[PDB]
Design a protein around this ligand. Structure first.
Ligand SMILES: [Ca+2]
Ligand SMILES: [Ca+2]
Ligand SMILES: [Ca+2]
Lengths: 536, 534, 532
């Protein structure tokens, strides 16, 4: 069996890999996108399909007003004592010398079954993890944040004992590790194999310096000794490697006795003429931080990645038959049923009658006019991940705005300060027109407002389409579905990436979605017949 | 007979002036501080006292997660048909090419309440205003915002007819004015006097270029023609005038027949050596945008400010009796209610932040988020109202690790403040440290060598002395002998003049705080909180 | 035998390694410091001694008004046909999307002159090289610059045939190499060993991504094939290696039949708490780009660096016996000590004098340290992370624009300067000025340090200790007082300053200025440099 990486394409960072018997699960972070956490299932480690979006109630995740790249960071999904355990962090500050957040524990006997009310696990840091030792005791790990605890200078891994019968954490903290010169020590996971406790952490930050560092000790509280190579996985030293930023590992032993590690990684696109190791020369990643997997071998009590430290595109799969669940390729929601397609997500808040409805006009997705795309509160935006470098997204829209503050259409979105948006609005002199708005480092670009493209009065529908092709992407429209016209504006797909945006936020990924807004608050709605995503 | 400006000192902008009979009221904006809107009362237009904080529950104002300088922008308070009408905006986006928000209307039969639930008045802009015409019909004004409507290039003043019986706004908008080259046309107000409608706007932005601009028309829908001098008030051309940024006017005719206009203004502190007209040369305003008032005279059907366009420190008071006469303040935390001089950030003061009932005579503050959070800070602060003062408190606190701290803060927004606190250190014990955020950049010079606190020191006194350009923290262990924290902080950095950005000037605060980044649970107790001006 | 790197310490980049029989020479760049080019000699490749500063006439090197990090870039010293050949570049634009300059050739029958007047060699690029082919023909290489030729996107290596009897160049250019994705292709040198032509270039830029790239071909015009490992030397992949930025190689076969390569390298100081691979985490280099040497082995017609690609502190020396050869200038002689240099212009009577007051170096009052024209500044290199520099000064200013003292200097926008001046209400005072990213810092102008009126001499001293340094003074020569300002030594490096200028290295020297132009002078009894 040959596994091609990434196993989870598009925005899918911080893979937490677990297993229940012969069923394997990975949980990835979702940041400000609702619902929180995405859980994928596989029986062969090669083909993964979404099976659970657990944090789908405000009582579990209340992310309105959360900053960009806040919300759900790295989760921990483990299985023990007949149920799954899910730890997650809701981060409330991002653009600051230090951050605040909240950690919670939810459990469920089955991966899709209803998850319990959250248990507060503290606020002192991020990357929470739960270790189930062989003696029945349980230990809660995390990396503390705060003043001087963002690698200025401190970045530590602490441990509290956890009582599962009372849901209590003991007030004592034991520092397990303080980090190597790479620093950014985070993502701690504990394992017990042979006579050793193994401590796996991420270091070097989640960009091109990302690495997986492993330590080991005889007792759980230390002292820990470094892996002889220090870093177990990294691709920093191979700048031409297809997979980059390989870190934040999650080690698992299969039911067949084999060893695999899930990790996050990114696939960069490079600009012509830029030296490879200059600033920005290593590339830009519109598909954000994705999830890969590597086969692990053991030598003299230490784990190694087969073939080398770097993330490889192809790895050797386990001793099982390939058992795919979902058909791959094209994607479309015709909005014929009761629920949005699970590949669609909202910004911060859940989808309900406030943002839209699937029953007001059956066969259409109706979106109500609320805030514009730059808002961290109430956007009627329904978006899905960029999962390929070349694809087309298309919709058919019916919309009748009455003034300039009502608009609706298609958007390619990264955060509230970096997106583009091709929409239909009303102009007081002409009528319905198509315009485009782009935010680039929070700087606006609206080149069609002075001379917009007229929408014919008799046009019952306005088809909208975006064609993404590596570094660029363009919008196109149609009033009959057969004859299309390009919006004469070329957009930079590489700008929809943390490599370009920068700041304190972490790389998520580019989305494409349907949006309708009414800054006036008067009230309006846009009906969308379908939404398509077709890879090349 | 002589009124000395500012009349409302400290963070007090957008003064909406109205009257009910012989009682006069001014409502000021409060931005992200809760409760929202502050209403002051007066019978001589000289001596003002706070009488109402109307938006004091989440169903009226829900600001958790609001950005800095979001929240309550310019309010409008009016009286008509036997009740008070209060329009206000809850702004949800600030640092963006354009903003979003929500407008609401609440009513009350009397200034102290009870106030209604909010009626949504649309989201299309800010500076809402309700005009009650003589024929019983009501009109709603605002500045539309959005893409290309933050003076890039558009800044319009539109009007909708309002049906008070059902709270309905008509969909049609009528543009009244599109602005002059000064731009930033906002703060629209309609008045009917003589045989003219008068439209009063603010232009030039709320900084040193602030101005009040008046138009008039025979009919309400226009077209409006400009004042002979366009600008009726501004101090931009006098860079050494004591009062600066004079704009955003609120015109009112008294029960005596006289005319008075409330406006916002700032008193800048200048750094030495900086040329006056170079960047930052006109000064820095740690007291924020305050409220002044001026007498208005009429000539040829146009209004004028007495003695010139600029804002003067002294003006002539109305023809009413002077009442007895910004002052010394202290809260001993005896009652079950916070002193109305104190406010919280965004969220109300309930048992999540603290309690005045859990320990009588003490303000108990529970440990939540740090001072850089827009969600749940246990922070209770009051306004800077003088350039020279001293704030003080007596605190009891015994943390157990480094993420528990509590103390005193001088605060402007989530990215600009200083914080002198007691925390714990594993090998030492209780220590005193300082943290400053300056342009979101941290300073913590006392972390590698902190000030120790004795083990059986039941109480730590904290004190900050502000002296114009600088301020310094100090501590005590006995209430008798005090020691200086050897850090001098810049008071001119707690100002919009220094911070910049797309947020607007609010004002510096001083307050009490306690946090637990760990979420384990802690609490600090404060016996009192004094504000003593020099 | 064990060689310890760097073999040349302090500001000593772009080592051009040549040999005349059993005598080995290395020429290094000097940028805006006059005289230009420093040529060191050795007979064992371990111990090196300065022997020649050849570009010491304005007719050879006219650098007045040159921008910071302009002037002399990478030179090429070679020996052929009974004389030395020295190619050099005088760069005239730095802070611009592309640069201009001038390339010159001078020759000499011996290493210490006489050096001929310069022959123009074209202005189209930098890093000039002269290859002496075994058939008698000569070839001139350089990397062209200009619009879109600063790795945006182009970085080429071109070759022109040089006609030695007439000193002219063929107008035709042959492109030898266009670069790997590392780009910044420069520093080309040609070699003929066995039956191959070898093209050696530098790639990755002269910071922490520096690398030596090697190609080979059967004919001199190519096409050239890349080394099996592409990069023959680099330390980029080892961020904790003591030697960093190891690139711009110069290969040479000794008279023993052994092969060595000089290369530039840097030794960084790291701030505490800064992540190793974050910005600035790899370190700051106050000693600038120094020179190391490595032993080369051959394997199937390809050269390799012994032990690995990275630069090592200790390498194996050649098959010759070791032949070895603190600092102070008492200003006793007709000349400054050759370790001292001036900025752009030669040291003549307008700047100073050693004969006006015998036994003292007298410096006259001209421009201040921020000037690219005429400052009376005389400085030497930092060569250690911990040292002390001292001087005894006699100076009597009359107004506030006359000052003189001790300076630690990187470029015209980054330096510190402790001096004696005159204040209108007090008399002689001691003050300090720091330029930090061209931002001024004068914490003592409001409360200066008074100088006793009958103190005939004011001693000045700077103590450098790795990351920080401090000034001290005295009025008797035995009891010293610190000046209560601590300066950052790591800021006197290209790692901190940034910009389009390239890493030179920190200097320390003596300075006197008169902004008024009235006329002043300061006498210096001595100048000491004493490492720890
Ligand atoms: Ca449909
Ligand atoms: Ca009390
Ligand atoms: Ca002497």
């Amino acid at each position: 069996m040959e596994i091609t990486n990434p196993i989870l394409t598009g925005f899918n960072p911080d893979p937490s890999l677990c297993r229940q018997g012969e069923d394997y699960y990975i949980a990835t972070s979702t940041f400000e996108w609702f619902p929180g956490v995405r859980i994928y299932h596989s029986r062969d480690l090669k083909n993964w399909t979404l099976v659970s979006t657990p944090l789908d109630r405000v009582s579990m995740l209340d992310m309105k007003g959360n900053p960009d790249s806040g919300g759900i960071w790295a989760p921990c999904l483990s299985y023990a004592d007949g149920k799954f355990w899910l730890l997650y962090t809701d981060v409330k500050i991002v653009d600051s010398p230090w951050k605040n957040g909240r950690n919670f524990l939810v459990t469920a006997p089955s991966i899709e079954g209803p998850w319990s009310e959250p248990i507060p696990m503290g606020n002192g840091g991020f990357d929470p993890s739960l270790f189930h030792d062989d003696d029945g005791r349980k230990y809660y790990l995390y990396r503390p944040w705060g003043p001087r605890h963002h690698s200025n200078p401190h970045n530590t891994i602490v441990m509290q004992e956890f009582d599962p019968q009372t849901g209590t954490l003991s007030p004592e903290r034991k520092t397990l590790f303080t980090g190597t010169p790479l620093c950014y020590t985070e993502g701690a996971h504990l394992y017990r194999h042979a006579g050793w406790y193994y401590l796996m952490v991420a270091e070097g930050g989640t960009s091109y310096e990302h690495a997986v560092v492993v330590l080991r000790a005889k007792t759980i509280d230390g002292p820990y000794e470094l892996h002889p190579d220090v870093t177990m996985m990294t691709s920093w030293h191979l700048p031409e490697n297809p997979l980059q930023k390989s870190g934040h590992g999650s080690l698992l032993q299969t039911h067949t006795g084999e060893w695999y590690m899930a990790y996050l990684t990114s696939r960069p696109l490079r600009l012509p003429g830029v030296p490879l190791l200059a600033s920005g020369g290593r590339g830009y990643c519109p598909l954000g931080r994705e999830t890969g997997i590597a086969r692990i071998e053991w030598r003299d009590g230490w784990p190694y990645v087969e073939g080398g430290k770097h993330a490889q595109l192809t790895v050797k799969g386990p001793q099982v038959a390939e058992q795919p669940a979902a058909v791959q390729g094209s994607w479309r929601d015709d909005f014929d049923g009761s629920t949005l397609d699970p590949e669609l997500q909202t910004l911060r808040i859940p989808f309900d009658d406030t943002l839209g409805s699937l029953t007001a006009r059956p066969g259409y997705l109706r979106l109500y006019g609320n805030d514009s795309l730059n808002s961290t509160f109430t956007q009627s935006t329904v978006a899905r991940r960029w999962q390929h470098f070349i694809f087309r997204a298309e919709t058919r829209m019916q919309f009748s705005p009455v003034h300039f503050q009502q608009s609706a259409g298609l958007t390619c979105y990264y955060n509230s300060k970096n997106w583009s948006y091709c929409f239909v609005d009303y102009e007081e002199g002409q009528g319905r027109t198509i315009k485009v708005i782009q935010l680039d480092h929070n700087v606006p670009s609206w080149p069609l407002h002075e001379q917009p493209i007229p929408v014919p009065e008799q046009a019952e529908s306005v088809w909208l389409r975006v064609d993404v092709d590596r570094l660029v992407y363009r919008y196109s429209y149609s009033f009959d579905g057969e004859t299309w016209h390009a919006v004469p504006v070329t957009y930079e797909a590489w700008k929809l990436s943390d490599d370009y945006i920068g700041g304190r936020g972490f790389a998520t990924g580019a989305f494409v979605g349907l949006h309708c807004e009414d800054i006036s608050g008067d009230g309006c709605h846009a009906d969308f017949d379908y939404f398509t995503y077709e890879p090349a």
